[PDB]
Design a protein around this ligand. Structure first.
Ligand SMILES: [Zn+2]
Length: 385
């Protein structure tokens, strides 16, 4: 069968287990990761920059899993204006990619939500073929990620992911409004207020919280920065229809990886339940204005992705049409899941209807259950070598 562990990868504005006390990104007030492990399905939780680029998140992901210090790359860092080196991690799974005594390879299943879907596609692209750019120009001490030849991932499951981007990020200004409100929403919903533990992890830009700085001031200083308009190396570019398109050109479906994609769609009500993330201004559900914005945004400009009525359905954060797999500037094959997993292609699962964006990772009035994720892990462990 299969005994590869599961590594969970949060999306846009996602947070790690040591942050936002009282609310797990994966499961809300249930710890899905630990429950899955208690059922015998080993699961780990990776943490990456809630608003960094996919390239940056992919590098953080490699280090977070394998172990070591984050290397954004010699070439990439310089071209974008980074710190080349990031944080250092013990590693969730140090033996990742090794061989057993019997010479089998230690692979993992990547399960990703939202932007994480893009991130892990990027990770496997770097695993398999590294970066020719980095291998050429690097003095010494190059990051192992960029070598290539590493087949360490067995499957990729993406949930509510913007494989063709989101019109939420095309609106530019509403991207920052969404970010600010999500933090504000978390602080209210947990009761943490200004003492909420949340970090944007932008130290490679020098944008780390100062001492004695309030969460609110820290948040505003981050998204009022000039960086957002000057670089194309942040989430706001990669989440757009324009940037995702670009990513799609060079991040391709690998041959030896099973791909599963789940799609979400919802109309968010205006009435607020105590069971969901609130909008701190409107006293509606958090996703209410964003769902309406996306559902009414169209665009017919030359040179950009044409955005028509088929783009209006969404889950409050991501257009539904964008989630079955990368289509735009992509050659990835997308297939309807028949019951037999087809390797090398995207197995597009039946639509998760009336599931909004936060529902999908376990938070909300229609949250995917612990039992649902148990079902997913079972499926992933039934995949043959
Ligand atoms: Zn970068």
């Amino acid at each position: 069968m299969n005994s590869y562990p599961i590594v969970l990868v949060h999306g846009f504005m996602g947070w790690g287990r040591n942050e936002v006390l009282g609310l797990k990104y994966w499961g809300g007030i249930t710890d899905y990761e630990q429950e899955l492990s208690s059922y015998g399905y080993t699961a780990y939780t990776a943490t990456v920059g809630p608003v960094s680029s996919n390239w940056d998140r992919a590098c953080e992901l490699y280090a977070y899993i394998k172990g070591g210090t984050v290397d954004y790359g010699h070439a990439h860092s310089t071209q974008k204006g980074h710190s080349r080196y990031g944080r250092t991690y013990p590693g969730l799974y140090p033996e990742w990619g090794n061989l057993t005594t019997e010479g089998k390879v230690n692979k993992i299943h990547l399960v990703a939500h939202s932007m994480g879907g893009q991130t892990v596609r990027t990770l496997v692209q770097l695993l398999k073929e590294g970066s020719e750019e980095e291998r050429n120009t690097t003095p010494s001490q190059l990051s192992s990620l960029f070598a290539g030849g590493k087949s360490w991932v067995h499957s990729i499951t993406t949930i509510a992911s913007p494989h063709d981007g989101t019109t939420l990020a095309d609106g530019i200004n509403i991207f920052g409004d969404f970010a600010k409100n999500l933090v504000a929403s978390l602080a209210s919903f947990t009761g943490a207020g200004e003492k909420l533990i949340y970090d944007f992890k932008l130290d490679q830009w020098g944008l780390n919280r100062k001492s004695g700085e309030s969460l609110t001031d820290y948040t505003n200083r981050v998204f009022n920065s000039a960086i957002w308009n000057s670089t194309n190396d942040l989430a706001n570019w990669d989440l757009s229809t324009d940037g995702a398109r670009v990513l799609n050109q060079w991040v391709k479906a690998q041959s030896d990886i099973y791909y599963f994609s789940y799609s979400t769609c919802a109309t968010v009500p205006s009435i607020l339940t105590s069971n969901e993330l609130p909008h701190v201004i409107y006293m509606t559900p958090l996703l209410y204005p964003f769902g309406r914005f996306i559902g009414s945004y169209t665009r017919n400009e030359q040179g950009r992705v044409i955005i028509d009525n088929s783009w209006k359905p969404n889950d409050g954060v991501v257009n539904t049409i964008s989630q079955n797999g990368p289509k735009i500037w992509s050659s990835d094959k997308i297939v309807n899941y028949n019951g037999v997993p087809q390797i090398g292609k995207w197995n597009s699962m039946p639509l998760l209807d009336t599931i909004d964006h936060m529902d999908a990772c376990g938070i909300g009035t229609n949250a995917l259950t612990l039992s649902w994720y148990k079902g997913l892990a079972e499926k992933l462990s039934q995949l043959t070598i």
